[PDB]
Amino acid sequence: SRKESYSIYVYKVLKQVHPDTGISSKAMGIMNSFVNDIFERIAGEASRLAHYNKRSTITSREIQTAVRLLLPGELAKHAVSEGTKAVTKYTSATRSSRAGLQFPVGRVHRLLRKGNYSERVGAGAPVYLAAVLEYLTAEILELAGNAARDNKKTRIIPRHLQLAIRNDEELNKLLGR
Amino acid sequence: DPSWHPSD
Secondary structure, eight states, rough: OOOOOOOHHHHHHHHHHHHOOOEHHHHHHHHHHHHHHHHHHHHHHHHHHHHHHHOOOHHHHHHHHHHHHHHHHHHHHHHHHHHHHHHHHHHHOOHHHHTTOOOHHHHHHHHHHTTOOOOOOOSHHHHHHHHHHHHHHHHHHHHHHHHHHHOOSSSSOOHHHHHHHHHSSSHHHHHHH | OOOOOOOO
């Protein structure tokens, strides 16, 4: 099947690293394929780490259930009420721009949950992972764009990606494996 | 190989 489209975020990051440099359609496909592959690798390994070592965590769920156990009936009813009012008021009362990211911290989240990588997802995991995808994207586009200017073109083509990633030891190791 | 541009 098909994976998600990061194309617009690759484009924003591109416009920050090399603003007047364009990108072709195929090259954008390559970049999106990279961002996806790294998302599945980091999300996969992080998922293995999560399922392997599990830590005990108190959440509103266990507090609510404990309250329903300990308190008698009408008490427990109104206490569950006030608790839920308090947490929803705590919630309802920008995420990427908060972290200062072009990448969609909100979308990385709904994906980490969609992918069934874990039963729960923390916060700052989409911030960390979105920041990492944004950084890797930024490096690849900076090198490939420099390759676009030294080959004297106005846009990035898939060849420029091959040049930039092959002639960088670390990026070649990363995107070769 | 057309150039990429944002869309709606």
